[PDB]
Design a protein around this nucleic acid. Structure first.
Length: 49
RNA sequence: UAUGUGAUGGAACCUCUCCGGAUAAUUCUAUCUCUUCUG
């Protein structure tokens, strides 16, 4: 397709991949802290623990 | 809610250090209570 030099918006896509959304929750807002949990996770030297 | 000839992020241990310890005989004698009416 050599789509170089063409940023493109309506130009042809022989194969295009759409976005993926959660089934059954297309219109459901909530908040970030209501579904997700936050941890830190660290890196250890393994020479001195 | 991406934009398309190129995503090892499974590509990273919240790890390391610190006596729930210290002191104490389950023992034993002095009152308690305020208004009485001329005495």
């Amino acid at each position: 397709e050599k789509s170089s030099k063409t940023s493109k918006s309506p130009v042809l896509n022989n194969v295009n991949f759409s976005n993926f959304n959660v089934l059954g929750k297309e219109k459901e807002f909530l908040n970030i802290e209501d579904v997700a949990d936050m941890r830190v996770v660290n890196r250890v030297d393994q020479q001195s623990g």
